[PDB]
Amino acid sequence: GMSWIKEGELSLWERFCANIIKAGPMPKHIAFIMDGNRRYAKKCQVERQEGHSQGFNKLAETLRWCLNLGILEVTVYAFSIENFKRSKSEVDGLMDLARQKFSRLMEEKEKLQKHGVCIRVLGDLHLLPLDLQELIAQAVQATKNYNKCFLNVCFAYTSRHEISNAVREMAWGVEQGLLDPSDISESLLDKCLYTNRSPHPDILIRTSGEVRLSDFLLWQTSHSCLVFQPVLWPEYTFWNLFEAILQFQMNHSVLQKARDMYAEERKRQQLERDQATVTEQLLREGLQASGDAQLRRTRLHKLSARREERVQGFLQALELKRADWLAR
Amino acid sequence: GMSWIKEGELSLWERFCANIIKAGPMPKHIAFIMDGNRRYAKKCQVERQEGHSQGFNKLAETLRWCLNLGILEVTVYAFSIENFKRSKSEVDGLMDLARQKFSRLMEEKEKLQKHGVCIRVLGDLHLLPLDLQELIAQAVQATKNYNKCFLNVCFAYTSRHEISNAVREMAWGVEQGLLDPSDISESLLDKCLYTNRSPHPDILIRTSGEVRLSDFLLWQTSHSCLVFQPVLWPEYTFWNLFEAILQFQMNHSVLQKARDMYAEERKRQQLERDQATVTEQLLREGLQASGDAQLRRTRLHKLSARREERVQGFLQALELKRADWLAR
Amino acid sequence: HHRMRWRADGRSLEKLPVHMGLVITEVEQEPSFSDIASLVVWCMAVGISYISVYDHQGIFKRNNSRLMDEILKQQQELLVLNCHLAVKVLSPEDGKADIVRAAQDFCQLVAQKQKRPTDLDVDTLASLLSSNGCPDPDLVLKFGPVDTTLGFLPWHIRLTEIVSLPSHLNISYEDFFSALRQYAACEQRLGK
């Protein structure tokens, strides 16, 4: 009955305050752990399903706020593998509610082509009802090639499972001769998670007031600004999001410094580890550690170029296996 | 009868042309292989000794030209160990001529304190007549602490002997526990030659027209501009020196580029060789090549600081042994 | 004496963290080893079994002994392998880099035909993720103005409660203990 986004324009104060923060560093990607749907239903004295139903309305409301603020990529936590342990009523109800919107998204296609909405559902989707997986794939398949903005729905997802699958993909590449165990790198692992196409979130917003990540983007939100707001998700307001963007701008200087240093340190550490591997090979086989042959320097340039070859080739097969989803 | 320098001012054209080249890169140190004294005597139909005697007059003339051009450090080849194989007449004559000037230099002291002339005789002086060594030391001892300009007389010198002595000084430091064999470096060797106080010559001028270094500053003149002029030394003119400074200015761009690259390459090569030594020690003794302990980085900083300690301490004893010349 | 009072304080809380995480985001100046050590012994007294110290620069990992010495100082004044076990000083590579290590090991056992990629279960990786003899942290105290974990054991903070204090410099027991009350009242529904 309701599509995935709303057309509401910003208000005077909302547009004025927006123009103000937009002068500073804005987040390119915000992540949301939509928590509090059930607690909100109790205070409102409404059925649990209606709480979750309102939660979706808010997700569409919040997405438009993001687009109005220029935040073009949004990742959300919609269903956890853990949530499979709730009552059948609630779990079936959440599946039903998913089937309704994913079907309406296809009915409201072309409107998705209108705004370049790339819907990407991320998770261990093989645990979902077969019907729901086909709807998901159908949606994901049509909204692919769209690039005006990006929404990542995390249905039946846990970060540990995403990390472990990404490890499996790397061991698979070793099993097929596409990878050697030495090639497994933090960067390589990054290109194996479900979020391989999405940059690491700038902000991580959890509502309800819980101060835990509940197994969500643990790898990705390492240097993300963690915003924990007491508001129950179905009551989220533009100003709640505003405050979150504020907390990001406050720390952005030090956050970005720490990010660059981690990256610069990581590169130095590998270059030292690589030079040692080249040194261990050159110390053996007789040879000379340096000299003018620049033998270590030439051997290093090859090891890197051959490193990418196996890795870049492996990534092509992973994506081909990924794009092998004629399940639509 | 003649002192070691003359008071002649520059001429109009000489001073004009001088002001012109002085706009460009000037050499800080010029080296002279005063060749052709004997051939010049034959053409002039004069005794060999008079040729050498004129040669000294020219050395005083040329030194003033250097001072007039701002070139403050001059090294000259005056007597080679090889020249000990000439006739006794000529060899004794050269010693006599040396004894005369070195004695007159002390008689014309204070005039040496006037212009801050630091006379430094460099060579294997233990091969000279005992009288001549005392005159040399006496001269060298008085003109020390003088810094307005520097003249290095190479009497009874060969570069191979200077290099070998410098090696001996380093093996001596090993024998006394002042050095380890691993510390022996190109820089360390530089601080062990007789020219340890003198920068590497910018120009190397040999007269007579021979195109050979005849065992002179081989180590030092590696990246020096080699000027070979046909003029016989006792006929050297200001313009001869001018032309030599011209040849230097022509190549100075590429000469200095090559010098800096050799230096930058030498440093990189050691840093690679040192990192390998630190890696070989860290690969052994279990440990970890990198990590966050920055253990390799800390171990490297110590190896360098301890490297200088042994080297810088060794240099103090070499100079004390050197300054132990109460032979004056 | 005072040991029993601190033990009673921890016993009264509805819940105590078995593994404590001290994350210092402050980088304006060098950390205060005394204030750090003072927190550590507090954890030991109230009854926290494991305490992990973390900073993004690795300053603690560098100056490990300076901390352990400071710990033993407070540990005796007004309070060996006894603390080296529970106290573990960490750095950024104890997280993502260690996860990479575990992949490199399993990719190798897979390549050795000893294990199959299909056997890289979540629980399997966890065991392979240097479980050692430490459980997953349940309470992290984030000291600083930065609002980030700065890469503290990302695999293990999956359900950790993250409490923030403005600075660790000149920290007070009441400040540290008020954090423990907060965790004690925190509700974990485990997705149910």
Added chain:
Amino acid sequence: HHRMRWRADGRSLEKLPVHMGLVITEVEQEPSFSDIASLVVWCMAVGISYISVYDHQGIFKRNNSRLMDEILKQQQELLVLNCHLAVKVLSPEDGKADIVRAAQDFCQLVAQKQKRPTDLDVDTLASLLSSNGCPDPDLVLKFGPVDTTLGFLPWHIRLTEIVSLPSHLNISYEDFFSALRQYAACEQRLGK
């Protein structure tokens, strides 16, 4: 045929270098391996026993085989271990750095109490200065506009005659042979 003519050319010269040194100072562009190789075989034909190739960047040491291949090409067309012996490609560290090596060795034998510092004679170091099976160069051909040895075997050029040609690119036999006449007329008095 032409081999005998080149052998006669070298035989007629009053003197021939036993060891030839080819120093390229030119660095505006990559050296011409053909022109280099063409000089080398000329040396072999006129009767030069050893030929050493040197550049400050070490380009030749890097692309050794590219030269040796080019040599063998000319060496057969219009003319193994046969050239690898006489032809030695050098770099800056074959000089001062090698002298440092020799010191490091003797300092070690001194430290081993096997040798005494007082035994570091000039002739002793020379033997220790990688004499190998090569005599000291007696004729160096300096190709380029720079007027410097750029650090070519400083210990060994003590009495070497240094002749300069403006470029090695498109070099000609008459240019190369006119240099040999110059050396042939050069007078070495050996300080007497």
